[PDB]
Write an enzyme that holds these catalytic residues in place. Structure first.
Site, PDB file in Angstrom:
ATOM      1  N   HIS A 113      11.078 -21.595   1.465  1.00  0.00           N
ATOM      2  CA  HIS A 113       9.860 -21.478   2.307  1.00  0.00           C
ATOM      3  C   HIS A 113       9.430 -22.849   2.853  1.00  0.00           C
TER       4      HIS A 113
ATOM      5  N   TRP B  26       5.479 -22.483   3.447  1.00  0.00           N
ATOM      6  CA  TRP B  26       4.585 -22.082   2.387  1.00  0.00           C
ATOM      7  C   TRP B  26       4.753 -22.906   1.109  1.00  0.00           C
TER       8      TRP B  26
ATOM      9  N   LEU C 275      -3.245 -12.537  13.118  1.00  0.00           N
ATOM     10  CA  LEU C 275      -2.191 -13.511  13.448  1.00  0.00           C
ATOM     11  C   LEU C 275      -1.133 -12.791  14.301  1.00  0.00           C
ATOM     12  N   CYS C 276      -0.793 -13.381  15.451  1.00  0.00           N
ATOM     13  CA  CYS C 276       0.189 -12.702  16.367  1.00  0.00           C
ATOM     14  C   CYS C 276       0.885 -13.762  17.191  1.00  0.00           C
ATOM     15  N   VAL C 277       2.230 -13.718  17.241  1.00  0.00           N
ATOM     16  CA  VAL C 277       2.973 -14.582  18.173  1.00  0.00           C
ATOM     17  C   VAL C 277       3.687 -13.666  19.123  1.00  0.00           C
TER      18      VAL C 277
ATOM     19  N   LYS D 216      10.282 -19.441  16.196  1.00  0.00           N
ATOM     20  CA  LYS D 216      10.316 -20.797  16.654  1.00  0.00           C
ATOM     21  C   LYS D 216       9.310 -21.624  15.854  1.00  0.00           C
TER      22      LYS D 216
ATOM     23  N   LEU E 231       6.116 -21.231  15.271  1.00  0.00           N
ATOM     24  CA  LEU E 231       4.810 -21.315  15.889  1.00  0.00           C
ATOM     25  C   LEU E 231       3.730 -20.820  14.902  1.00  0.00           C
TER      26      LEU E 231
ATOM     27  N   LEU F  11      -9.702  -5.206   8.363  1.00  0.00           N
ATOM     28  CA  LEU F  11      -9.673  -4.289   9.547  1.00  0.00           C
ATOM     29  C   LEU F  11      -8.331  -4.471  10.273  1.00  0.00           C
TER      30      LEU F  11
HETATM   31  C1  LIG Z   1      -9.328 -22.733   4.209  1.00  0.00           C
HETATM   32  C2  LIG Z   1      -8.904 -22.027   5.514  1.00  0.00           C
HETATM   33  C3  LIG Z   1      -7.402 -21.579   5.459  1.00  0.00           C
HETATM   34  C4  LIG Z   1      -7.144 -20.698   6.698  1.00  0.00           C
HETATM   35  C5  LIG Z   1      -5.625 -20.213   6.673  1.00  0.00           C
HETATM   36  C6  LIG Z   1      -5.232 -19.338   5.484  1.00  0.00           C
HETATM   37  C7  LIG Z   1      -3.772 -18.887   5.537  1.00  0.00           C
HETATM   38  C8  LIG Z   1      -3.610 -17.771   6.670  1.00  0.00           C
HETATM   39  C9  LIG Z   1      -2.123 -17.315   6.754  1.00  0.00           C
HETATM   40  C10 LIG Z   1      -1.889 -16.184   7.760  1.00  0.00           C
HETATM   41  C11 LIG Z   1      -2.396 -14.805   7.287  1.00  0.00           C
HETATM   42  C12 LIG Z   1      -2.127 -13.763   8.402  1.00  0.00           C
HETATM   43  C13 LIG Z   1      -2.810 -12.401   8.080  1.00  0.00           C
HETATM   44  C14 LIG Z   1      -2.250 -11.368   9.077  1.00  0.00           C
HETATM   45  O1  LIG Z   1      -2.812 -11.357  10.212  1.00  0.00           O
HETATM   46  S1  LIG Z   1      -0.920 -10.352   8.730  1.00  0.00           S
HETATM   47  C15 LIG Z   1      -0.405  -9.672  10.364  1.00  0.00           C
HETATM   48  C16 LIG Z   1       0.678 -10.632  10.922  1.00  0.00           C
HETATM   49  N1  LIG Z   1       1.047 -10.206  12.293  1.00  0.00           N
HETATM   50  C17 LIG Z   1       2.084  -9.456  12.597  1.00  0.00           C
HETATM   51  O2  LIG Z   1       2.842  -8.999  11.732  1.00  0.00           O
HETATM   52  C18 LIG Z   1       2.275  -9.143  14.079  1.00  0.00           C
HETATM   53  C19 LIG Z   1       3.756  -9.167  14.546  1.00  0.00           C
HETATM   54  N2  LIG Z   1       4.493 -10.342  14.082  1.00  0.00           N
HETATM   55  C20 LIG Z   1       4.235 -11.536  14.533  1.00  0.00           C
HETATM   56  O3  LIG Z   1       3.369 -11.686  15.417  1.00  0.00           O
HETATM   57  C21 LIG Z   1       5.031 -12.699  14.031  1.00  0.00           C
HETATM   58  O4  LIG Z   1       6.226 -12.131  13.395  1.00  0.00           O
HETATM   59  C22 LIG Z   1       4.276 -13.582  12.982  1.00  0.00           C
HETATM   60  C23 LIG Z   1       3.147 -14.288  13.699  1.00  0.00           C
HETATM   61  C24 LIG Z   1       3.748 -12.724  11.790  1.00  0.00           C
HETATM   62  C25 LIG Z   1       5.233 -14.651  12.423  1.00  0.00           C
HETATM   63  O5  LIG Z   1       5.773 -15.391  13.519  1.00  0.00           O
HETATM   64  P1  LIG Z   1       7.390 -15.568  13.635  1.00  0.00           P
HETATM   65  O6  LIG Z   1       8.019 -14.319  13.053  1.00  0.00           O
HETATM   66  O7  LIG Z   1       7.607 -16.025  14.972  1.00  0.00           O
HETATM   67  O8  LIG Z   1       7.711 -16.647  12.527  1.00  0.00           O
HETATM   68  P2  LIG Z   1       7.615 -18.289  12.643  1.00  0.00           P
HETATM   69  O9  LIG Z   1       9.031 -18.813  12.896  1.00  0.00           O
HETATM   70  O10 LIG Z   1       6.665 -18.647  13.617  1.00  0.00           O
HETATM   71  O11 LIG Z   1       7.135 -18.747  11.274  1.00  0.00           O
HETATM   72  C26 LIG Z   1       7.819 -18.369  10.093  1.00  0.00           C
HETATM   73  C27 LIG Z   1       6.927 -18.761   8.881  1.00  0.00           C
HETATM   74  O12 LIG Z   1       5.805 -17.858   8.917  1.00  0.00           O
HETATM   75  C28 LIG Z   1       5.702 -17.192   7.707  1.00  0.00           C
HETATM   76  N3  LIG Z   1       5.119 -15.841   7.960  1.00  0.00           N
HETATM   77  C29 LIG Z   1       5.722 -14.756   8.537  1.00  0.00           C
HETATM   78  N4  LIG Z   1       4.835 -13.721   8.588  1.00  0.00           N
HETATM   79  C30 LIG Z   1       3.638 -14.174   8.026  1.00  0.00           C
HETATM   80  C31 LIG Z   1       2.367 -13.601   7.863  1.00  0.00           C
HETATM   81  N5  LIG Z   1       2.108 -12.314   8.150  1.00  0.00           N
HETATM   82  N6  LIG Z   1       1.393 -14.372   7.318  1.00  0.00           N
HETATM   83  C32 LIG Z   1       1.686 -15.644   6.994  1.00  0.00           C
HETATM   84  N7  LIG Z   1       2.890 -16.236   7.128  1.00  0.00           N
HETATM   85  C33 LIG Z   1       3.850 -15.491   7.676  1.00  0.00           C
HETATM   86  C34 LIG Z   1       7.168 -17.094   7.258  1.00  0.00           C
HETATM   87  O13 LIG Z   1       7.173 -16.738   5.865  1.00  0.00           O
HETATM   88  C35 LIG Z   1       7.649 -18.476   7.655  1.00  0.00           C
HETATM   89  O14 LIG Z   1       7.189 -19.460   6.658  1.00  0.00           O
HETATM   90  P3  LIG Z   1       8.255 -20.060   5.596  1.00  0.00           P
HETATM   91  O15 LIG Z   1       8.593 -18.878   4.797  1.00  0.00           O
HETATM   92  O16 LIG Z   1       9.358 -20.657   6.401  1.00  0.00           O
HETATM   93  O17 LIG Z   1       7.559 -20.992   4.614  1.00  0.00           O
HETATM   94  N1  LIG Z   2      -4.271  -8.658   7.942  1.00  0.00           N
HETATM   95  C1  LIG Z   2      -3.833  -7.227   7.822  1.00  0.00           C
HETATM   96  C2  LIG Z   2      -4.994  -6.229   7.952  1.00  0.00           C
HETATM   97  C3  LIG Z   2      -4.740  -5.026   7.085  1.00  0.00           C
HETATM   98  O1  LIG Z   2      -4.552  -5.294   5.896  1.00  0.00           O
HETATM   99  N2  LIG Z   2      -4.669  -3.794   7.523  1.00  0.00           N
HETATM  100  C4  LIG Z   2      -5.026  -3.419   8.928  1.00  0.00           C
HETATM  101  C5  LIG Z   2      -4.738  -1.923   8.961  1.00  0.00           C
HETATM  102  C6  LIG Z   2      -5.653  -1.137  10.001  1.00  0.00           C
HETATM  103  O2  LIG Z   2      -7.088  -1.295   9.614  1.00  0.00           O
HETATM  104  C7  LIG Z   2      -4.966  -1.450   7.546  1.00  0.00           C
HETATM  105  C8  LIG Z   2      -4.208  -0.165   7.226  1.00  0.00           C
HETATM  106  C9  LIG Z   2      -4.917   0.733   6.331  1.00  0.00           C
HETATM  107  C10 LIG Z   2      -4.305   1.960   5.937  1.00  0.00           C
HETATM  108  C11 LIG Z   2      -3.065   2.266   6.482  1.00  0.00           C
HETATM  109 CL1  LIG Z   2      -2.268   3.821   6.023  1.00  0.00          CL
HETATM  110  C12 LIG Z   2      -2.381   1.448   7.361  1.00  0.00           C
HETATM  111  N3  LIG Z   2      -1.142   1.835   7.899  1.00  0.00           N
HETATM  112  C13 LIG Z   2      -1.098   2.632   9.013  1.00  0.00           C
HETATM  113  O3  LIG Z   2      -2.020   2.957   9.736  1.00  0.00           O
HETATM  114  C14 LIG Z   2       0.279   3.107   9.485  1.00  0.00           C
HETATM  115  C15 LIG Z   2       0.735   2.412  10.748  1.00  0.00           C
HETATM  116  C16 LIG Z   2       1.625   1.340  10.541  1.00  0.00           C
HETATM  117  C17 LIG Z   2       2.040   0.667  11.738  1.00  0.00           C
HETATM  118  C18 LIG Z   2       1.548   1.162  12.919  1.00  0.00           C
HETATM  119  F1  LIG Z   2       1.953   0.489  14.068  1.00  0.00           F
HETATM  120  C19 LIG Z   2       0.653   2.189  13.207  1.00  0.00           C
HETATM  121  C20 LIG Z   2       0.255   2.864  12.009  1.00  0.00           C
HETATM  122  C21 LIG Z   2      -2.950   0.238   7.728  1.00  0.00           C
HETATM  123  C22 LIG Z   2      -4.464  -2.599   6.697  1.00  0.00           C
HETATM  124  C23 LIG Z   2      -2.719  -7.048   8.906  1.00  0.00           C
HETATM  125  C24 LIG Z   2      -2.001  -5.715   8.783  1.00  0.00           C
HETATM  126  C25 LIG Z   2      -2.085  -4.775   9.839  1.00  0.00           C
HETATM  127  C26 LIG Z   2      -1.430  -3.536   9.766  1.00  0.00           C
HETATM  128  C27 LIG Z   2      -0.740  -3.244   8.576  1.00  0.00           C
HETATM  129 CL2  LIG Z   2       0.079  -1.663   8.451  1.00  0.00          CL
HETATM  130  C28 LIG Z   2      -0.702  -4.107   7.463  1.00  0.00           C
HETATM  131  C29 LIG Z   2      -1.338  -5.355   7.576  1.00  0.00           C
HETATM  132 MG   LIG Z   3       7.483 -18.722  16.445  1.00  0.00          MG
END
Ligand SMILES: CCCCCCCCCCCCCC(=O)SCCNC(=O)CCNC(=O)[C@H](O)C(C)(C)COP(=O)(O)OP(=O)(O)OC[C@H]1O[C@@H](n2cnc3c(N)ncnc32)[C@H](O)[C@@H]1OP(=O)(O)O
Ligand SMILES: N[C@@H](CC(=O)N1C[C@H](CO)[C@@H](c2ccc(Cl)c(NC(=O)Cc3ccc(F)cc3)c2)C1)Cc1ccc(Cl)cc1
Ligand SMILES: [Mg+2]
Length: 411
Positions: free
Chosen positions: A2, A5, A159-161, A168, A170, A411
């Site tokens: 990682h 991380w 979080l969304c890229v 890459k 990001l 949410l």
């Molecule tokens: C005190 C305040 C602190 C505030 C910050 C607190 C921390 C917040 C942390 C975020 C909490 C988010 C809560 C939510 O919203 S969870 C919802 C996340 N969003 C999605 O799944 C939407 C679709 N996917 C994407 O948009 C991209 O695939 C994302 C953006 C997820 C990764 O982009 P990409 O696929 O282009 O990858 P990379 O090359 O840029 O980067 C790769 C690195 O990223 C690590 N990675 C992958 N997925 C996650 C993830 N869900 N949380 C944290 N880290 C994640 C991965 O292990 C690797 O690290 P390492 O393994 O090499 O070490």
């Molecule tokens: N930072 C989290 C927020 C979260 O924990 N969620 C956000 C999501 C909507 O409020 C909620 C959740 C609560 C209960 C269920 Cl059953 C599901 N899963 C589904 O709705 C199924 C589903 C999976 C993918 C889809 F594209 C559409 C539906 C998802 C859980 C990002 C995330 C978003 C979506 C998912 Cl599935 C898991 C994590």
């Molecule tokens: Mg990237």
């Protein structure tokens, strides 16, 4: 394994997790004045952007990024389609901090390429009850109780890229810049969930789904006709019969929540959420914001007996895009939100939730196994879904807990 991380203040393995006995910070205490005042340097083709959540165009830009590039199911059949009104509600609670919403745009055309959002939450996150019993056995109750007070921290979500920019590195850039903006306001912990495994969750739970319109769920392949339903001369008639609901709530004191209920709902919810190890503390302004009905977004009903609110439930709406069905564009899902039961069993309160959702045209009701959501799975015909939701902290050591000790809905 990682590269990002491994450099961060989180527990690094489940084994390190195992040896955590008290709640508290992972890192060196730091100060605000130590944090760089300027945004992190970034690739010259990109620019940091702080959206104005009062501007329709800014909300629209975030809406489009997420509509096309946010979370999908495993088999790329569905993608969440959070609405603009939902995003305004989720991103802008009372006393939200505009600078905690961090974006990256392409300089040349201002196309939104990446986003992450932080909002304030007041969270109880002190040592969990089962560990406090272990502390009493060791004569260590004062150290176990050190961080009992609710704390003002950051909840990270969205979080969304963009798909074209995936892999890459990001996402680390986004998370580092979010961390800097949050630390510049003297906050040093965050809470977040994800549907993937990262170092290292403090709780994990299954998803659950309650079919409301099984004919539509099967058309769009959210559901199948289960194998057992084929031995029946007629599958769908029997599936509709299985999941039928009454037209109207059974509890005759049920009505929509209005602004005058805010104090009573705050009191019954906070008394209930006390039961749990990790859970939010809400002011009257926050109960108003997250629970008063808002068209198309959040739906809340109270049971009023003898002019007193004794119970309530809430659910929120998120439609999903159905990728490639000729019959249906959208899954219209309800999600169980907060609730509190003092007068009737929880299954009886939530049955009214299902009835209301179904009457309002929702196709499915979903939830995670937090709160006391297990107690009603079997009686209300919920089934487990795929995978698990994982709960994490940033910069907070915490013993593993069961998801039935978690009361924060994300949410
Ligand atoms: C005190 C305040 C602190 C505030 C910050 C607190 C921390 C917040 C942390 C975020 C909490 C988010 C809560 C939510 O919203 S969870 C919802 C996340 N969003 C999605 O799944 C939407 C679709 N996917 C994407 O948009 C991209 O695939 C994302 C953006 C997820 C990764 O982009 P990409 O696929 O282009 O990858 P990379 O090359 O840029 O980067 C790769 C690195 O990223 C690590 N990675 C992958 N997925 C996650 C993830 N869900 N949380 C944290 N880290 C994640 C991965 O292990 C690797 O690290 P390492 O393994 O090499 O070490
Ligand atoms: N930072 C989290 C927020 C979260 O924990 N969620 C956000 C999501 C909507 O409020 C909620 C959740 C609560 C209960 C269920 Cl059953 C599901 N899963 C589904 O709705 C199924 C589903 C999976 C993918 C889809 F594209 C559409 C539906 C998802 C859980 C990002 C995330 C978003 C979506 C998912 Cl599935 C898991 C994590
Ligand atoms: Mg990237």
């Amino acid at each position: 394994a990682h590269a990002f991380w491994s450099t961060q203040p989180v527990p690094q393995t489940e084994d390190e997790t195992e040896k955590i006995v008290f709640a508290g910070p992972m890192d060196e205490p730091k100060t605000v004045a130590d944090i760089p005042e300027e945004p992190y340097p970034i690739a010259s083709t990109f620019e940091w952007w702080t959206p104005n959540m009062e501007a329709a165009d800014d909300i629209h830009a975030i809406y489009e990024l997420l509509r096309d590039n946010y979370v999908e199911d495993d088999d790329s059949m569905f993608r969440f389609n959070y609405s603009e009104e939902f995003l305004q509600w989720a991103l802008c609670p009372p006393n939200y901090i505009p600078d905690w919403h961090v974006a990256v745009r392409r300089k040349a055309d201002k196309k939104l390429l990446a986003f992450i959002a932080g909002v304030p939450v007041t969270l109880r996150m002190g040592t969990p009850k089962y560990m406090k019993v272990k502390a009493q056995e060791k004569g260590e109750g004062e150290e176990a109780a050190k961080y009992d007070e609710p704390r003002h921290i950051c909840e990270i979500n969205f979080l969304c890229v963009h798909k074209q920019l995936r892999e890459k590195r990001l996402a680390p850039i986004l998370i580092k810049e979010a961390t800097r903006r949050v630390n510049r306001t003297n906050v040093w912990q965050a809470v977040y969930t994800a549907g993937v495994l990262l170092p290292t969750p403090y709780a994990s739970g299954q998803y659950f789904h309650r079919s409301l319109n099984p004919e539509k769920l099967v058309e769009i392949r959210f559901s199948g006709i289960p194998a057992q339903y084929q031995k029946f001369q007629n599958p769908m008639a029997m599936l509709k019969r299985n999941y039928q609901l009454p037209s109207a709530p059974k509890n005759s004191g049920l009505r929509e929540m209005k602004p005058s209920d805010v104090p009573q709902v705050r009191r019954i919810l906070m008394n209930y959420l006390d039961s749990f190890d990790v859970g939010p503390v809400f002011s009257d302004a926050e109960i108003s914001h997250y629970l008063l009905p808002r068209d198309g977004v959040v739906f809340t009903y109270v049971v009023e007996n003898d002019k007193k609110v004794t119970d309530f439930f809430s659910f929120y709406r998120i439609p999903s895009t159905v990728i490639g069905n000729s019959n249906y564009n959208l899954l219209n899902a309800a999600y169980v939100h907060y609730y509190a039961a003092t007068s009737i069993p929880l299954h009886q309160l939530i049955l009214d939730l299902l009835i209301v959702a179904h009457s309002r045209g929702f196709d499915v009701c979903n939830m995670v196994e937090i709160l006391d959501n297990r107690s009603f799975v079997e009686q209300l015909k919920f089934g487990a879904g795929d995978g698990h939701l994982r709960y994490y902290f940033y910069n907070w050591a915490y013993p593993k807990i069961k998801p039935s000790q978690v009361a924060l809905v994300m949410l």
